[PDB]
Design a protein around this motif. Sequence first.
Motif, PDB file in Angstrom:
ATOM      1  N   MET A 294       0.815  -1.214   0.000  1.00 44.89           N
ATOM      2  CA  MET A 294       0.000   0.000   0.000  1.00 44.89           C
ATOM      3  C   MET A 294       0.851   1.268   0.000  1.00 44.89           C
ATOM      4  SD  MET A 294      -2.554  -1.438  -0.587  1.00 44.89           S
ATOM      5  CE  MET A 294      -3.480   0.062  -0.907  1.00 44.89           C
ATOM      6  N   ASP A 295       1.617   1.466   1.067  1.00 42.70           N
ATOM      7  CA  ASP A 295       2.531   2.600   1.158  1.00 42.70           C
ATOM      8  C   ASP A 295       3.858   2.164   1.785  1.00 42.70           C
ATOM      9  OD1 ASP A 295       3.802   5.136   2.210  1.00 42.70           O
ATOM     10  OD2 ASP A 295       2.020   6.000   1.251  1.00 42.70           O
ATOM     11  N   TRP A 296       4.944   2.274   1.024  1.00 42.53           N
ATOM     12  CA  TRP A 296       6.236   1.775   1.490  1.00 42.53           C
ATOM     13  C   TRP A 296       6.881   2.694   2.529  1.00 42.53           C
ATOM     14  CZ3 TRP A 296      10.339   4.868   0.980  1.00 42.53           C
ATOM     15  CH2 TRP A 296      10.375   5.792  -0.074  1.00 42.53           C
ATOM     16  N   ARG A 297       6.559   3.982   2.467  1.00 42.42           N
ATOM     17  CA  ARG A 297       7.046   4.935   3.461  1.00 42.42           C
ATOM     18  C   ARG A 297       6.587   4.558   4.868  1.00 42.42           C
ATOM     19  NH1 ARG A 297       4.419   8.529   3.081  1.00 42.42           N
ATOM     20  NH2 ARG A 297       3.621   9.050   0.992  1.00 42.42           N
ATOM     21  N   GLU A 298       5.581   3.694   4.952  1.00 41.54           N
ATOM     22  CA  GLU A 298       5.008   3.321   6.239  1.00 41.54           C
ATOM     23  C   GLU A 298       5.558   2.001   6.760  1.00 41.54           C
ATOM     24  OE1 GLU A 298       0.796   3.341   5.985  1.00 41.54           O
ATOM     25  OE2 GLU A 298       0.665   5.348   5.094  1.00 41.54           O
ATOM     26  N   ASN A 299       6.119   1.197   5.864  1.00 41.57           N
ATOM     27  CA  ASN A 299       6.610  -0.121   6.246  1.00 41.57           C
ATOM     28  C   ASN A 299       8.130  -0.208   6.399  1.00 41.57           C
ATOM     29  OD1 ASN A 299       4.051  -2.322   5.822  1.00 41.57           O
ATOM     30  ND2 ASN A 299       3.877  -0.308   4.848  1.00 41.57           N
ATOM     31  N   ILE A 300       8.819   0.900   6.131  1.00 39.30           N
ATOM     32  CA  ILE A 300      10.255   0.990   6.383  1.00 39.30           C
ATOM     33  C   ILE A 300      10.493   1.405   7.831  1.00 39.30           C
ATOM     34  CG2 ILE A 300      10.686   1.632   3.985  1.00 39.30           C
ATOM     35  CD1 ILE A 300      11.139   4.471   4.865  1.00 39.30           C
ATOM     36  N   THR A 301      11.688   1.124   8.341  1.00 36.35           N
ATOM     37  CA  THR A 301      11.998   1.340   9.752  1.00 36.35           C
ATOM     38  C   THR A 301      11.982   2.819  10.141  1.00 36.35           C
ATOM     39  OG1 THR A 301      13.353   0.373  11.523  1.00 36.35           O
ATOM     40  CG2 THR A 301      14.483   1.701   9.855  1.00 36.35           C
ATOM     41  N   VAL A 302      11.967   3.076  11.445  1.00 41.21           N
ATOM     42  CA  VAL A 302      11.792   4.429  11.973  1.00 41.21           C
ATOM     43  C   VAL A 302      12.914   5.408  11.603  1.00 41.21           C
ATOM     44  CG1 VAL A 302      11.373   5.826  14.021  1.00 41.21           C
ATOM     45  CG2 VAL A 302      10.426   3.515  13.880  1.00 41.21           C
ATOM     46  N   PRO A 303      14.175   5.053  11.911  1.00 41.82           N
ATOM     47  CA  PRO A 303      15.286   5.956  11.589  1.00 41.82           C
ATOM     48  C   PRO A 303      15.315   6.346  10.113  1.00 41.82           C
ATOM     49  CG  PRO A 303      16.048   4.193  13.002  1.00 41.82           C
ATOM     50  CD  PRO A 303      14.631   3.854  12.637  1.00 41.82           C
ATOM     51  N   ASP A 307      15.049  10.153   7.860  1.00 41.05           N
ATOM     52  CA  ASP A 307      16.099  10.531   6.922  1.00 41.05           C
ATOM     53  C   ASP A 307      15.547  10.999   5.575  1.00 41.05           C
ATOM     54  OD1 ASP A 307      19.345   8.986   6.104  1.00 41.05           O
ATOM     55  OD2 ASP A 307      18.695  11.075   6.288  1.00 41.05           O
ATOM     56  N   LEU A 308      14.849  10.114   4.872  1.00 43.05           N
ATOM     57  CA  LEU A 308      14.313  10.453   3.556  1.00 43.05           C
ATOM     58  C   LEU A 308      13.077  11.343   3.647  1.00 43.05           C
ATOM     59  CD1 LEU A 308      12.060   8.379   4.104  1.00 43.05           C
ATOM     60  CD2 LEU A 308      13.157   6.867   2.452  1.00 43.05           C
ATOM     61  N   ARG A 309      12.670  11.664   4.871  1.00 44.64           N
ATOM     62  CA  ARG A 309      11.537  12.555   5.088  1.00 44.64           C
ATOM     63  C   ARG A 309      11.820  13.927   4.488  1.00 44.64           C
ATOM     64  N   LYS A 310      13.098  14.229   4.300  1.00 46.78           N
ATOM     65  CA  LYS A 310      13.516  15.530   3.793  1.00 46.78           C
ATOM     66  C   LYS A 310      13.260  15.696   2.295  1.00 46.78           C
ATOM     67  N   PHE A 311      12.468  14.797   1.713  1.00 43.79           N
ATOM     68  CA  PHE A 311      12.149  14.869   0.288  1.00 43.79           C
ATOM     69  C   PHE A 311      11.455  13.611  -0.242  1.00 43.79           C
ATOM     70  N   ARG A 312      10.407  13.761  -1.057  1.00 41.02           N
ATOM     71  CA  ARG A 312       9.726  15.034  -1.341  1.00 41.02           C
ATOM     72  C   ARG A 312       8.531  14.915  -2.305  1.00 41.02           C
ATOM     73  N   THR A 313       8.649  14.350  -3.519  1.00 43.50           N
ATOM     74  CA  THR A 313       9.785  13.643  -4.170  1.00 43.50           C
ATOM     75  C   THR A 313       9.634  12.117  -4.201  1.00 43.50           C
ATOM     76  OG1 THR A 313      11.582  15.273  -4.390  1.00 43.50           O
ATOM     77  CG2 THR A 313      12.219  12.977  -4.093  1.00 43.50           C
ATOM     78  N   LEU A 323      12.474   2.090  -5.525  1.00 44.00           N
ATOM     79  CA  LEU A 323      13.724   1.716  -6.167  1.00 44.00           C
ATOM     80  C   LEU A 323      14.666   2.910  -6.163  1.00 44.00           C
ATOM     81  CD1 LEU A 323      12.452  -0.370  -9.246  1.00 44.00           C
ATOM     82  CD2 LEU A 323      13.002  -1.127  -6.923  1.00 44.00           C
ATOM     83  N   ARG A 324      14.113   4.085  -6.440  1.00 47.08           N
ATOM     84  CA  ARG A 324      14.884   5.322  -6.414  1.00 47.08           C
ATOM     85  C   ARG A 324      15.451   5.604  -5.025  1.00 47.08           C
ATOM     86  NH1 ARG A 324      13.933  10.239  -9.363  1.00 47.08           N
ATOM     87  NH2 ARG A 324      13.194  11.013  -7.334  1.00 47.08           N
ATOM     88  N   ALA A 325      14.647   5.357  -3.997  1.00 51.18           N
ATOM     89  CA  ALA A 325      15.069   5.607  -2.622  1.00 51.18           C
ATOM     90  C   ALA A 325      16.183   4.656  -2.202  1.00 51.18           C
ATOM     91  CB  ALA A 325      13.882   5.508  -1.660  1.00 51.18           C
ATOM     92  N   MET A 326      16.097   3.408  -2.652  1.00 50.52           N
ATOM     93  CA  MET A 326      17.124   2.421  -2.340  1.00 50.52           C
ATOM     94  C   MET A 326      18.446   2.820  -2.983  1.00 50.52           C
ATOM     95  SD  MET A 326      15.208  -1.290  -2.439  1.00 50.52           S
ATOM     96  CE  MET A 326      15.228  -1.260  -4.229  1.00 50.52           C
ATOM     97  N   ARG A 327      18.387   3.164  -4.264  1.00 52.86           N
ATOM     98  CA  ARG A 327      19.561   3.631  -4.987  1.00 52.86           C
ATOM     99  C   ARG A 327      20.168   4.820  -4.252  1.00 52.86           C
ATOM    100  NH1 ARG A 327      22.594   7.949  -6.836  1.00 52.86           N
ATOM    101  NH2 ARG A 327      24.227   6.973  -8.116  1.00 52.86           N
ATOM    102  N   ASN A 328      19.336   5.823  -3.993  1.00 56.09           N
ATOM    103  CA  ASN A 328      19.760   7.023  -3.286  1.00 56.09           C
ATOM    104  C   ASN A 328      20.532   6.704  -2.011  1.00 56.09           C
ATOM    105  OD1 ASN A 328      18.971  10.277  -3.092  1.00 56.09           O
ATOM    106  ND2 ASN A 328      19.250   9.290  -1.091  1.00 56.09           N
ATOM    107  N   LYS A 329      19.964   5.845  -1.170  1.00 56.71           N
ATOM    108  CA  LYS A 329      20.571   5.521   0.121  1.00 56.71           C
ATOM    109  C   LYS A 329      21.761   4.568   0.008  1.00 56.71           C
ATOM    110  CE  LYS A 329      17.900   8.341   2.064  1.00 56.71           C
ATOM    111  NZ  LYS A 329      19.098   9.097   2.525  1.00 56.71           N
TER     112      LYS A 329
END
Lengths: 386, 386
Positions: A294-303, A307-313, A323-329
């Motif tokens: 449903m929403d991956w931003r909700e199923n990833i860990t707290v810390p 971090d990626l809360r800063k964008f955005r995006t 996939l973009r977020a994984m690459r980014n990190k």
Amino acid sequence: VIVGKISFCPKDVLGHGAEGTIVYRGMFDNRDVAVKRILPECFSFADREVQLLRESDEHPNVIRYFCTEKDRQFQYIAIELCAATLQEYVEQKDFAHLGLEPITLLQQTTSGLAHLHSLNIVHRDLKPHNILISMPNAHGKIKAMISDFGLCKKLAPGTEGWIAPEMLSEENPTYTVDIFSAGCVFYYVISEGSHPFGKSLQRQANILLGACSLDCLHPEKHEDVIARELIEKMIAMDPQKRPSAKHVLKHPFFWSLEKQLQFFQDVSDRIEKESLDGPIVKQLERGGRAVVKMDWRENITVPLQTDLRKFRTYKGGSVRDLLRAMRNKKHHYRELPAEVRETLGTLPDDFVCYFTSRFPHLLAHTYRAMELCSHERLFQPYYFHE
Amino acid sequence: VVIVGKISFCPKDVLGHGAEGTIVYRGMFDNRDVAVKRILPECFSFADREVQLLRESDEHPNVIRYFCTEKDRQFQYIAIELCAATLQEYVEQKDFAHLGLEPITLLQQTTSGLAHLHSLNIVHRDLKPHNILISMPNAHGKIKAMISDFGLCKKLVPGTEGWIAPEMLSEDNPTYTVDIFSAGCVFYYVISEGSHPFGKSLQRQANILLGACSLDCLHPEKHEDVIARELIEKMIAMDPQKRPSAKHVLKHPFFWSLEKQLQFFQDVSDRIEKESLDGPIVKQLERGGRAVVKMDWRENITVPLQTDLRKFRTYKGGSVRDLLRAMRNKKHHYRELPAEVRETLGTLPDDFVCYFTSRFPHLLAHTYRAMELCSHERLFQPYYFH
Ligand SMILES: Nc1ncnc2c1ncn2[C@@H]1O[C@H](COP(=O)(O)OP(=O)(O)O)[C@@H](O)[C@H]1O
Ligand SMILES: Nc1ncnc2c1ncn2[C@@H]1O[C@H](COP(=O)(O)OP(=O)(O)O)[C@@H](O)[C@H]1O
Ligand SMILES: [Mg+2]
Ligand SMILES: [Mg+2]
């Protein structure tokens, strides 16, 4: 008894095959071999096939035929003496001990199966008994070998339970029949004793009316999802949709963690991007949905959220942006806070398992769909395509 | 021109192939041509102390002949009556001709040869269309049938998948009952022009282990099909103890000609006039209906016949006994009856018996089973046995 160069012991039986066939423990030239006696009126040896292998590069996982010879009533074949068959490797006690893990075993058998095919050689009887466990060689290691190719029944077809459905519609036919059998074997190893069809007596019957079944595979585990989508692709009723042996090797089923992490990376780099709205991006968003939970931003860990809360995006209901977020990190891994690398990494194993265990369908989903770019240089390591 | 005197045979003249590398050729024994079966000692053992029991008693018309057995280094040979084909070619080969004999007497012969085996205490263990043989035209042109391949033991599991009684796969020592089962399948196989009760190629042995059974070809209103069904479903009985002996099968109405059935109705009637009814015997043939009678048999008979016995009597109408009784009496003076009555009934004794049998498809079946209390009695010896 002797025929020279073999030479075997009258009552030192290794086992019984079909159509009267019998295998003994014999000698050649001075080493120990296995001697398989066949009735020429039953089994026809393929000299022109064994000849092709002899004159081409030798493969580690394709057994050898030292020589053939005949008397009045029989034809003899000298074959590397192996310790046992795959059925003893799967169904027997605490085996020995083992040596290779199931996955590598599968890989080896496939390489061999692709080797034969590369010489236009259809085994047409692949099964647990035609996959042999070599004896502890030198350092004490053990590998697996395909045998019983070149032999072909007649009358004046393989083994029940591992025969391709088309074989029984009506005369060879093609390599695609070996893949089906391999498909069944893949499951047999992984399920540790189970067949996809699956009980011996009505096994071949279930094969004909498509009565599949892959219970032992969990529907929401990364490992099991990858395997399922492959096995079922290989046991496809329709021969037209079965992967070649080369394709199976290129499957995520055999990828290591770092290669899984690499494919994820390349895909991101590949999709940045065009219309979305674009033939490609649509494909990896088509499945949506539940892949992202449903929403991956909700199923990833707290810390990581912070971090990626800063964008955005990063949408959150989008596979691509995951996939973009994984690459980014991955790329910025070293520059991240200590709390972010402390739940994420380390690289590459823990990192990729981090998204892999929260999104079981991610890899599978991505691999399919991304086939649109299998003809591209960047994805040659992942698809083969031919 | 291979020679193992007394037995000789020329390879290339192969007639068929059997299991475990077994081969069959044309050959000679004395001056006459025979069939030579070459078995591997490692696969099949021969029962000499059985084939000799046969030798003692006089040959049965429907049992194959074993002329001699001899061995060489590597094989074991057997000389048998060179027959023309198997029951399979008889049934499945549309446009077979003549077909010389009739299918039902085919089944009769087979059951006889079978009963002969069991009298000597010999269990066949592998009855099937390939083990029932059609002799060549004997002299004038007559053709007969013969059971074969008895006295053969498979070395590791007797019989052939799809004809083996259920009690032989649970394992935890075969008797004659196992053969009846196989016969039952063959019966239906012949009756239905090539269908199996269990009933298709690959999964007929599985369906046998769960009690399937489907005799679709048998119509519940046809008097013929009803008799065939009572018997056939009693042969393939899951419980062996409920299967008839080979001799019972011979005495069954399934083999009775038209006039013999009429004589059985006539016999049954004459035999019950009577105890009370109020009578152990009469109570028996009344038990099952009613349903056999169709509530009122006076209502399901032709018009001119109703008129004839409208004023009688006596003729209960809800009574089986009185239904038989009316048939007997209309026969005992069939000679004197009017014109329109003799017409709708006779002629005798064939069309006469069908008049009643087609209108009461469970009459003969019901009676024959209800009238089993007099199996031993001397009036009913042509009908029962026991
Ligand atoms: N090269 C070999 N080394 C050791 N054992 C063998 C070898 N080849 C065959 N066998 C044994 O002989 C048995 C019979 O083999 P075969 O005649 O090919 O029939 P199947 O493979 O169908 O069982 C096998 O189950 C296997 O255990
Ligand atoms: N006496 C015979 N005369 C002619 N053909 C025979 C005879 N016996 C056997 N055959 C043929 O040989 C074939 C193989 O027989 P066998 O080896 O006993 O296996 P199966 O009986 O299971 O077929 C049969 O299908 C039959 O057609
Ligand atoms: Mg083998
Ligand atoms: Mg036969």
